[PDB]
A paper describes a structure:
In the consensus class 2 map, the density for the N-module is substantially lower in resolution than the density for the rest of the enzyme but when the N-module is locally refined its resolution improves to the same level. Within the ndufs4−/− N-module, residues 61-68 of subunit NDUFV3 that are adjacent to NDUFS4 and resolved in the wild-type enzyme, remain disordered even after local refinement.
Mammalian complex I (NADH:ubiquinone oxidoreductase) is central to cellular metabolism, with key roles in NAD+ homeostasis, respiration, and oxidative phosphorylation. Complex I is a ‘boot-shaped’ enzyme, with a hydrophilic domain in the mitochondrial matrix that contains the cofactors for redox catalysis, and a membrane-bound domain that transports the protons.
Residue numbers in the entry:
A (entry chain F): 9 to 436
B (entry chain G): 6 to 693
C (entry chain E): 5 to 214
D (entry chain s): 30 to 60
E (entry chain S): 14 to 95
């Protein structure tokens, strides 16, 4: 009801997150994968979509969009074209490493999720798009896919369900932008990973011009367990619209950086202390945290003493549980330099298609590089803020939002530090 | 009907579904700012300059890409919209180079105009701008890429309109660069139009660079004569000189583009130019004289001769007024050997019926056709805009193209049915596989390039094509209002001469060698001094001293198509007239005026004294020649085929080869093209 | 480095390159993963395969990929320039890639980069004179909890320290390949001090079903 | 007690493509 | 002698029906009997049908065919040809 966290291992979906249990089909079956999958498949797509809806699962990728609603867009009557389920395994957000573990220690969860989600959407195949860097993880993924094919779980008739499904693994190259829906679709199609215009939406025209639904690795991998254990069980955890269990990557200045699974809406302090040991030098030596990935703005220690790791809670705090990649900084950190590095990341990773981001992320990068040294003057902070607001709502894709938000968080919570550094520079 | 109601600042407007916000605003009258959007190209949405605010909506949409919805109120003067435009313009101008004084887009710059109107008046960018390296892209297009705004109109035009797939965006981020990754050359018959579509000055013309500013130039409206398409063009003139040639929008012909030759051959007008009457070739070498002397000598010779001993040749760039003047003069002399350089089969119905030698389906009907059969022709290098229309149809309205000739790159997929003229009889009799496609075709076309007709078996080729066309009509059951048979011309004056009744081909001249030849812009070299008697007394009447001029006993300088008001008919029968841009150089005179003055100096005086009276004579001869921009239909192709059946000839087994087999042959075709310097550079670059 | 190609004696439109027969079999396998037609989708995997065979993508390799997939060569140039794992200039035998984004920089990737460049006697972005090592700075490579971190070719070495990085560089310098994964004594992504989550046996196949 | 995901310590450079080629037999006829 | 015949007619007007059906009927049998004599059939919209005939030294004589019938047009053509 109230007060969240302390998830029991009975309720943890990913039971091999740490890799000390066999990840191949032999161990996956022991841990409970591929159980009653034939029954789940034969119960129909409407039942599966209803389960996902009543579970309250929200997209575990960047932005949290109700998974049941998003997947129902492809439940429309057939138009005579094939339907595809593209899995977004291009974990590019800085600070995020959860998809890597789901794929290298529990590929069969992802594979069965592909099967059930493809049945729900009516898809015939499911292309998995995995970073080019994640070579060993893609290799494990194909070993698991081949195990499934050889065991008959996929292919002609999956699990005897009479449903024809194929799982393709497609490796990308170096491009954070290729995690975007339409950019990912274009990369699969072989062109440059440049986001398309919307509308039309992927559910109407997608990969190869046919209907498509892009889903996160975590979102697809949670689905079989939701179906098996009931949507109500999943909804039991979390507050209200923020339901489920989430993988948290606590990194930065923390004693024991780790990937852990915890209840949705677990307090940030509980998450950082119970599992990660605590911020380096004690809770007092805490300056700011980036609850999301890199596209999320900062929250200072004052706001992070009581914030709850939730979509709604972090939106209220003026940030957002993007990918739940807690990055911790401990006072000794150079906050403006760190945020400048993040803006440099966005400058490097911008596709360059559309003018706002193309020509404005470089502007922000230059201004932030000057700020790190204090070369600018105090009147330029508002200029940076205005540039950020100009970039925010005018880009083709959300990467512009992600590049604008960290700067806004810095200007909103650490303006005095910027002024102090500028004054010290002017003192020379 | 299936129309939706949308509001533009509360102004209700009816728009069909799929209409975008930009087009709704345009219907009301508002012209949303834009850069990346073009009407003839795919929507891109890169620039984001067209951002507008939809009422009671959180974020601003892209007017060019957003499809409108019922009840939407589009606010175009709102704070949010204006601030979005200001921000987008600021981002566009951040990295732009301060080249306005030395930029060819001086007073025509959309970036300048939209910065003045919708942008801010000051810059707060306090950093160092980027600097891209320029790249060599051929002798026709200058690349100053530091000015590029990455709008991609050039890329889209090359990919779609020209179908070349050479330009693209390389890299990513602020370092994205538009161009060929390698040291390619962007050579194509439509490459020039990239200059127009580039909203900024990143792509400009090497020949025209730095020469003038837009506010100085005077924009005349004339027609192109480098081919039989009749591309409407705008001639930019500064102080009695041609500064550059630009396209003029004609949805039924041009569609905003013009061929590279049409664009860049205007240089030839300022070289190897006949600028004074010149006579005395019998006494040795040609020497200048005066009009009243040269015309006196010509009139003396004409009075001495009569009958078929005098004959005339019209070639290439000639106008209907001059043609009718010369025809009337020779008729009054009692001659009918007035021929034209380009052959046309005259065995069947010949020139009796206009449906026998016109693109009856018009350029714009290709979009309405289902199947196209290109017989012995290379549309890309003759009628390049006709090829552009074919590609547009193929790309959009699912079209099928087949070719009965040499296999050449046409910029679109096509079936190579073989390069034999017996395939025509095969298709007519049903022995070929293409009849399977012709069966389900609903709106067929059978274009027959005149280059094929100029073989020695042109009569057989035309007879076979018409006989196939009749069977195509009967099997396909096409209505009587859809003309399938078409003939694609490559010479500007061919259609007008045929309408006026000039004998096609210069065969009668060889049959009865004249004692006084009258070359009227006849630089084709069909008839040389080796033919004719030993003292023919040839008379050249043209603008350029090329093949014709050296062989002559007198030269009478005429006007070029940029200096005279002339009537030119294109390959589809449309009659168009040019306008006087420059004035003739020196003592040059209009060709019809020269003919009439020669007449009056001679005993025989013609019954016109003004351009309008010559036009009335044209009305008397062929009425359609005076209806400008109106395509009169035609009939009695059944009669044409009936008469063609009786013709007894066989198709020679030689392959059907197009004369312009490669791009290198496109840049030299007319006297002006041969005398142009830029065309020589293009030829050399292609050959290299 | 540069997004414009200038021919030289090496990296020339005629410089030798072609897939081996087994590589052609692999190419067919890749192409058959997409609908009929739509084979241009394999440009990315095919180009990566060409790089895996050679070591870098010369203009001849790009043209060969474009020819075998039947796409305009510019459609391959765009891909090769757009994506960052495609090497358009020759690269050392072992390609070292030190992550530098904020999550690693906070855990002292600067020291790792400094130690690597000092040991190899090169500056970030340069090749060792032996043509054995190439050091570059890369954005997030995933695995931000095992920071600081580097990638040698297709392997992740993570939880690194200056001593560990110079030791795994000594092994590559001499012979053998160091075993990938964290070098901090914790297997991967788990809490260092000790487990705080999945510390009890996982439940049976049918535990909790509706 | 002991890490289990060790099979990736022996993958060569062509492991991914070899697995894809092997799966080519199971893959279902394309549209 | 005669050098040309030029038949001007409207594409689809009541006053040119006779000429238009004369073309369909007797044109072939005339062009196959006077093979060397041009007979230029030129049409223009909303034109007044008129037969043009040019003789020796550029002397052209004109008639009218407006609201005339097929047989009348044929008679006029025969008279000009003879
Ligand atoms: C620049 C950018 C980079 C991204 N990277 C990822 C990723 O690794 N995973 C992911 O699920 N979504 C990513 N996204 C978000 C995707 O576009 C999309 O929202 C997500 O894949 C949908 O998955 P979901 O419905 O389960 O939430 C990115 C978006 C942007 C704009
Ligand atoms: S916001 Fe940036 S990354 Fe996204 S489409 Fe525009 S230029 Fe590309
Ligand atoms: S395109 Fe030329 S004229 Fe226009 S703003 Fe840029 S430099 Fe100035
Ligand atoms: S060169 Fe010109 S047309 Fe091409 S992208 Fe740049 S600004 Fe647009
Ligand atoms: S004109 Fe609409 S974004 Fe460019
Ligand atoms: S920040 Fe270095 S691995 Fe992500």
């Amino acid at each position: 009801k109230t007060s969240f966290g302390s998830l029991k291992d009975e309720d943890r979906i990913f039971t091999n997150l740490y890799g000390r249990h066999d990840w191949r089909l032999k161990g996956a079956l022991r841990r409970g994968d591929w159980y009653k999958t034939k029954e789940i498949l034969l119960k129909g797509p409407d039942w599966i979509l209803g389960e996902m809806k009543t579970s309250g699962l929200r997209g575990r990728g960047g932005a949290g969009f109700p998974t049941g609603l998003k997947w129902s867009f492809m439940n429309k009557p057939s138009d005579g074209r094939p339907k595809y389920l593209v899995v977004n395994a291009d974990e590019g957000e800085p600070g995020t490493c959860k998809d890597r573990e789901i794929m290298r220690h529990d590929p069969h969860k992802l594979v069965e999720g592909c099967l059930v989600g493809g049945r729900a959407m009516g898809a015939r195949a499911a292309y998995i798009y995995i970073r080019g860097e994640f070579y060993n993880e893609a290799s494990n993924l194909q070993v698991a896919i081949r195990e499934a094919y050889e065991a008959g779980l996929i292919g002609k008739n999956a699990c005897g369900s009479d449903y024809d499904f194929d799982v393709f693994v497609v490796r990308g190259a170096g491009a954070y932008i290729c995690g975007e829906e339409t950019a990912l679709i274009e990369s699969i199609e072989g062109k440059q990973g440049k986001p398309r215009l919307k509308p039309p939406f992927p559910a109407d025209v997608g990969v190869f011009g046919c209907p498509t639904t892009v889903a996160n690795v975590e979102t697809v991998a949670v689905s079989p367990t939701i179906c098996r254990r009931g949507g109500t069980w999943f909804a039991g955890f979390g507050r209200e619209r923020n339901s489920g269990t989430k993988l948290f990557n606590i990194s930065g200045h923390v004693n024991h950086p780790c990937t852990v699974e915890e209840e949705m809406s677990v307090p940030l302090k509980e998450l950082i202390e119970k599992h990660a040991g605590g911020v380096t030098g004690g809770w007092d030596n805490l300056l700011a945290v980036i609850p999301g990935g890199s596209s999320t703005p900062l929250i200072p220690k004052s706001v992070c003493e009581t914030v709850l790791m939730d979509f709604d809670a972090l939106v209220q705090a003026q940030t957002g549980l993007g990918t739940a990649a807690v990055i911790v900084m401990d006072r000794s950190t150079d906050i403006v330099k760190a945020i400048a590095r993040l803006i440099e990341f966005y400058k490097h990773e911008s596709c360059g298609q559309c003018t706002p981001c193309r020509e404005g992320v470089d502007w922000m990068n230059k201004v932030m590089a000057r700020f790190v040294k204090g070369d600018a003057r105090p009147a330029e902070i508002d200029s940076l803020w205005e540039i950020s607001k100009q970039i925010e709502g005018h880009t083709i894709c959300a990467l512009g939002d992600g590049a604008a938000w960290p700067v806004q968080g810095l200007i909103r919570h650490f303006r005095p530090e910027l002024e102090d550094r500028m004054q010290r520079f002017a003192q020379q | 009907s299936n129309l939706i109601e949308v509001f533009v600042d509360g102004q209700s407007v009816m728009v069909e579904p799929g209409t975008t916000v930009l087009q709704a605003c345009e219907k009301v009258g508002m012209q949303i700012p834009r850069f990346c959007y073009h009407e003839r190209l795919s929507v891109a949405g890169n620039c984001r300059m067209c951002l507008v605010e939809i009422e009671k909506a959180p974020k601003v949409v892209a007017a060019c890409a957003m499809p409108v919805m019922k009840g939407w109120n589009i606010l175009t003067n709102s704070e949010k919209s204006k601030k979005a435009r200001e921000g987008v313009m600021e981002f566009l101008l951040a990295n732009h180079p301060l080249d306005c004084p030395i930029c060819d887009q001086g007073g025509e710059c959309d970036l300048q105009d939209q910065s003045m109107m919708f942008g801010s008046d000051r810059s707060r960018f306090l950093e160092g701008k980027r600097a891209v390296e320029d790249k060599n892209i051929g002798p026709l297009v200058k690349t100053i890429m530091t000015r590029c705004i990455q709008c991609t109109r050039c890329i889209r035009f090359a990919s779609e309109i020209a179908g070349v797939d050479d330009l693209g965006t390389t890299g990513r981020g602020n370092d994205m660069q538009v161009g060929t990754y390698i040291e390619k050359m962007f050579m194509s018959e439509l490459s020039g139009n990239v200059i127009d579509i580039c909203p900024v000055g990143a792509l400009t013309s090497k020949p025209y660079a730095f020469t003038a500013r837009p506010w100085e130039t005077r924009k005349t409206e004339s027609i192109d004569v480098m081919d039989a398409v009749g591309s409407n063009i705008v001639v930019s003139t500064r102080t009695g000189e041609v500064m550059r040639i630009l396209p003029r929008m004609h949805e039924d012909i041009n569609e905003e583009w013009i061929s590279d030759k049409t664009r860049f051959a205007y240089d030839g007008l300022k070289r190897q130019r006949l600028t004074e009457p010149m006579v005395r070739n019998e006494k040795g070498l040609l020497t200048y004289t005066s009009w009243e002397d040269a015309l006196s000598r010509v009139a003396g010779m004409l009075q001495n001769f009569e009958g078929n001993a005098v004959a005339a040749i019209a070639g290439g760039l000639v106008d209907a007024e001059a043609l009718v003047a010369l025809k009337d003069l020779l008729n009054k002399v009692d001659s009918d050997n007035l021929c034209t350089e380009e052959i046309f089969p005259t065995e069947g119905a010949g020139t009796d019926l206009r449906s026998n030698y016109l693109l009856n389906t018009t350029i714009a009907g290709v979009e309405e056709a289902d199947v196209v059969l290109l017989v012995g022709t290379n549309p890309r290098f003759e009628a390049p805009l006709f090829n552009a229309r074919i590609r547009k149809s193929w790309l959009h309205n699912d079209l099928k193209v087949a070719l009965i000739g040499s296999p050449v790159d046409l910029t679109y997929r096509y079936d190579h049915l073989g390069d034999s003229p017996k395939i025509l009889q095969d298709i007519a009799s049903g022995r070929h596989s293409f009849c399977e496609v012709l069966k389900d075709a609903k709106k067929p076309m059978v274009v027959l390039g005149s280059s094929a007709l100029q073989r020695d078996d042109g009569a057989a080729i035309l007879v076979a094509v018409s006989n196939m066309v009749q069977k195509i009509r009967v099997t396909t059951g096409v209505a009587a209002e859809w003309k399938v048979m078409n003939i694609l011309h490559r010479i500007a004056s061919q259609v007008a001469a045929l309408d006026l009744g000039y004998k096609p081909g210069v065969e009668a001249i060889r049959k009865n060698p004249p004692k006084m030849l009258f070359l009227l812009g006849a630089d084709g070299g069909c008839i040389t001094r080796q033919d004719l008697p030993k003292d023919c007394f040839i008379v050249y009447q043209g603008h350029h001293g090329d093949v014709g001029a050296p062989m002559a006993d007198v030269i009478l300088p005429g006007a070029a198509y940029t200096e005279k008001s002339a009537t030119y008919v294109n390959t589809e029968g449309r009659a168009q007239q040019t306008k006087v841009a420059v004035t003739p150089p020196g003592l040059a005179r209009e060709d019809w005026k020269i003919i009439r003055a020669l007449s009056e100096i001679a005993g025989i005086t013609l019954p016109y004294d003004t351009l309008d009276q010559v036009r009335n004579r044209l009305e008397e001869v062929s009425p359609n020649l005076v209806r400008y921009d109106d395509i009169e239909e035609t009939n009695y192709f059944q009669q044409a085929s009936e008469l063609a059946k009786l013709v007894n000839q066989e198709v020679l087994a030689d392959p059907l080869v197009p004369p312009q087999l490669t791009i290198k042959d496109f840049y030299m075709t007319d006297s002006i093209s041969r005398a142009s310097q830029t065309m020589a550079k293009c030829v050399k670059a292609v050959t290299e | 480095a540069l997004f414009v190609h200038r021919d030289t004696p090496e990296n020339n439109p005629d410089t030798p390159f072609d897939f081996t027969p087994e590589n052609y079999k692999r190419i067919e396998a890749i192409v058959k993963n997409y609908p009929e037609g739509h084979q241009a989708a394999a440009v990315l995997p095919v180009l990566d395969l060409a790089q895996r065979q050679n070591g870098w993508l010369p203009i001849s390799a790009m043209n060969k990929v474009a020819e075998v997939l039947q796409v305009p060569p510019m459609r391959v140039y765009e891909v090769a320039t757009f994506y960052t794992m495609y090497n358009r200039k020759p690269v050392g035998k072992y390609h070292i890639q030190v992550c530098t984004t904020t999550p690693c920089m906070l855990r002292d990737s600067d020291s790792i980069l400094e130690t690597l460049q000092r040991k190899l006697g090169i500056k970030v972005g340069e090749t060792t004179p032996d043509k054995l090592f190439t050091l570059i700075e890369v954005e997030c490579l995933g695995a931000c909890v095992n920071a600081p971190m580097v990638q040698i070719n297709d392997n992740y070495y993570e939880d690194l320290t200056p001593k560990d990085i110079e030791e795994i560089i000594d092994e590559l310098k001499a012979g053998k390949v160091p075993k990938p994964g964290p070098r901090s004594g914790r297997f991967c992504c788990e809490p260092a001090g000790g487990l705080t989550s999945l510390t009890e046996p996982p439940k049976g196949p049918g535990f909790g079903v509706q | 007690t002991t890490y289990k995901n060790l099979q990736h310590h022996d993958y060569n450079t062509y492991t991914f493509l070899d697995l894809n080629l092997d799966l080519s037999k199971f893959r279902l006829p394309q549209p | 002698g005669l050098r040309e015949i030029r038949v001007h007619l409207c594409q689809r007007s009541p006053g040119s029906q006779g000429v238009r059906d004369f073309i369909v009927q007797r044109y072939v049998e005339l062009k196959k009997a006077h093979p060397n004599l041009p007979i230029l059939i030129r049409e223009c919209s909303e034109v007044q049908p008129k037969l043009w005939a040019r003789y020796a030294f550029g002397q052209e004589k004109t008639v009218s065919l407006n609201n005339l019938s097929a047989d009348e047009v044929t008679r006029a053509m025969q008279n000009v040809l003879s």
